[PDB]
Paper text:
In this context, we recently reported the characterization of a novel xyloglucan utilization locus (XyGUL) that confers Bacteroides ovatus, and species harbouring syntenic XyGULs, with the ability to utilize this abundant vegetable polysaccharide across sampled human populations. Here, we present the three-dimensional structures of BoGH31, BoGH43A, BoGH43B and BoGH3B, expanding our knowledge of the structural determinants required for xyloglucan degradation. Our analyses highlight key adaptations in these enzymes that confer their specificity for xyloglucan oligosaccharides, while also providing a rationale for the maintenance of two divergent genes coding for GH3 enzymes, and similarly two divergent genes for GH43 family members, within the same PUL. While we were unable to determine a structure for BoGH3A, our structural and sequence analysis of BoGH3B has also allowed us to highlight further potential differences between these two enzymes encoded by the operon.
There are two GH43 family members represented in the B. ovatus xyloglucan PUL: BoGH43A and BoGH43B. Both enzymes have demonstrable activity on l-Araf-α-PNP, though BoGH43A was considerably more active, and both are thought to be responsible for the removal of pendant arabinofuranoside side chains from solanaceous xyloglucan substrates, thereby converting S to X for further processing by the α-xylosidase and other members of the PUL. Typical of all GH43s, BoGH43A has a two-domain architecture, consisting of an N-terminal 5-bladed β-propeller domain (residues 21 to 321) harbouring the catalytic active site, and a C-terminal β-sandwich domain (residues 322 to 522) which is frequently observed, though can be replaced by carbohydrate binding modules in some family members (see for example). Crystals of BoGH43A were obtained by hanging drop vapour diffusion (19°C) using 0.1 M Tris pH 7.2–7.8, 0.18 M magnesium chloride and 12% (w/v) PEG-6000 as mother liquor and were used for subsequent structure determination. Within the native BoGH43A structure, a TRIS molecule from the crystallization solution was observed bound in a shallow, enclosed pocket proposed to form the BoGH43A −1 sub-site. Together with Asp34 as the general base, which activates water to attack the anomeric carbon, Glu189 is ideally poised as the general acid, while Asp140 completes the triplet of residues and is important for modulating the pKa and orienting the general acid for catalysis. The positions of these residues are absolutely conserved with other GH43 members.
Author numbering: 19 to 522
The structure:
């Protein structure tokens, strides 16, 4: 196919996209905040269909997430390719700030961090004439310097080059050179409903820069975007097509009733007209749509998330994520190919890493389920599935060990000072329990199946887990977890599979 695609191109929690072209291959990275591994890494041949090939930050030495939460950890990343080397540059705001890692093979383990001198966030690199130029946004000014990207040494003084058109929170700077102009693209307006992309240019990389009279080049903040199901379009990165066409990846989100979003900021694609000696124009009127009826590069489908993920390979795919730095020894694979989680007393509301491993929710309408076999449990030990936004904002569905060798299914909502037990239901002595979470745009629905019978446990509003309600920079994840109620506990839980099916 050479025509038409659906947005978002990477659904669910995938913000701040940056992309690079390496020959006929495209590589893309997203911000990941408090989650480990960090900086998911995607590959495409057409900019539409993406396979997650790994993550850039896969080892604790690359990624200290001590006390990280949805408002901290890893912020926007940028990926670049130059002279056979890939660079990923980002900020760990919970740690030592701006750094990069590099590799000659994106599928391998990337380097240890190279810490950088210039401050602010949203660092980016541009290469020319054997030089490596870094931009970032300290004190709201886009600053430029030259660096040695292998040693981290700053080679020239930082220079303030632009501070945008006047909008709030000037960020996400990237430099491109085209038609003898240095173009400087940024985000303004904040990453909520006022998000916009603006652009300026200069004959000199160090300015002065003049803004495009047509700014902003992409936004749904104005009348033209007010009725769109997509809002908050911004944080773009321009990339060339294999046929000489132009494109941008950007973040946005899909709004829900009352102006909420729970799937995070996702990655979207837009075509760009960029004639010789002209300013770029994004999809004719600076808006994007869910159904994009436009010409594309020759399309090639990629592997996606299985509807039934099993653990027979004794490894988790790159899609799975933990909270902060996990205790690796508490995640093992059994001889018969189940995922075994080892209990600790850390709850999902402790602001520390629990025994917890999750997949991003990627559809409004979905069903997820897993069988749970809780073993060697003391009273009040529990294991199950959590619909998780933040340590103070999550819905937990679980099997619990009770006194006198009894067990129950519980449903608990954590919302700030509320911990609400919606249901506590006695289970039969025998029978494997499958826990089930469904959703539509309005509600999560909870249930369980045992001895061939499915039981409804009730429903809860989606809005209380939104970014607007809960705060932060992330989306809902669906996590398998286990928590013990004693230190003395030897409890563990086996999960034979994880099912996830989204409606397109």
């Amino acid at each position: 196919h050479h025509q038409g695609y659906s947005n978002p191109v990477i659904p669910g929690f995938h913000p701040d996209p940056s992309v690079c072209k390496a020959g006929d291959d495209y590589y893309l990275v997203n911000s990941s905040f408090q989650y480990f591994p960090g900086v998911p890494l995607f590959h495409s041949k057409d900019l539409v269909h993406w396979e997650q090939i790994g993550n850039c930050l896969t080892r604790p030495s690359q990624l200290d997430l001590t006390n990280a939460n949805s408002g901290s950890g890893i912020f926007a990343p940028t990926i670049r390719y130059n002279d056979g080397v890939f660079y990923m540059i980002t900020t760990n705001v919970s740690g030592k700030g701006n750094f990069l890692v590099h590799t000659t093979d994106p599928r391998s383990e990337w380097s240890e961090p190279v810490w950088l001198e210039q401050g602010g966030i949203d660092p980016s690199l541009y290469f020319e004439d054997g030089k490596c130029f870094m931009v970032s946004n300290p004190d709201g000014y886009i600053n430029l310097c030259e660096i040695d990207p292998m040693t981290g040494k700053q080679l020239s003084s930082s220079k303030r080059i632009w501070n945008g058109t006047g909008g709030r929170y000037a960020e996400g700077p990237h430099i491109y050179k085209k038609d003898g102009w240095y173009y400087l693209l940024i985000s303004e307006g904040g990453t909520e409903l006022g998000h916009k992309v603006t652009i300026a240019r200069s004959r000199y990389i160090d300015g002065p820069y003049q803004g495009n009279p047509a700014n902003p080049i992409l936004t749904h903040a104005n009348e033209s975007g007010q009725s769109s199901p997509i809002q908050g379009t911004g944080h773009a990165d321009l990339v060339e097509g294999t046929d000489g066409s132009w494109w941008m990846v950007c973040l946005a989100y899909r709004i829900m009733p009352g102006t909420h979003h729970t799937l995070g900021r996702e990655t979207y694609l837009a075509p760009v007209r960029w004639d010789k000696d002209a300013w770029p124009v994004v999809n004719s009127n600076g808006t994007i749509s869910l159904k994009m009826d436009v010409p594309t590069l020759p399309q090639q489908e990629m592997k996606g998330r299985p509807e039934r993920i099993d653990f027979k390979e004794g490894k988790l795919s790159p899609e799975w994520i933990h909270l902060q730095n996990p205790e690796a020894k508490n995640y093992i694979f059994t001889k018969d190919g189940k995922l075994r989680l080892i209990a600790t007393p850390v709850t999902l509301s402790d602001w520390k890493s629990p025994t917890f491993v999750a997949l991003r929710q990627e559809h409004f309408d979905m069903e997820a389920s897993a069988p749970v076999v809780l073993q060697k449990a003391g009273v009040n030990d529990e294991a199950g599935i959590s619909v998780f936004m933040e340590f103070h904002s999550h819905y937990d569905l679980f099997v619990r060990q009770d006194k006198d060798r009894k067990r129950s299914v519980g449903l608990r909502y954590k919302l700030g000072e509320i911990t609400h037990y919606a249901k506590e239901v006695s289970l039969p002595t025998d029978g494997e329990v499958e826990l089930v979470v469904k959703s539509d745009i309005n509600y999560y629905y909870f249930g369980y199946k045992v001895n061939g019978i499915y039981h409804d446990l009730g429903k809860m509003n989606t809005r209380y887990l939104s970014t607007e309600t809960a705060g932060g920079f992330t989306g809902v994840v669906l996590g398998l977890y286990i928590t013990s109620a004693s230190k003395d506990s030897k409890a563990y839980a086996d999960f034979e599979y994880f099912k996830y099916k989204g409606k397109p």
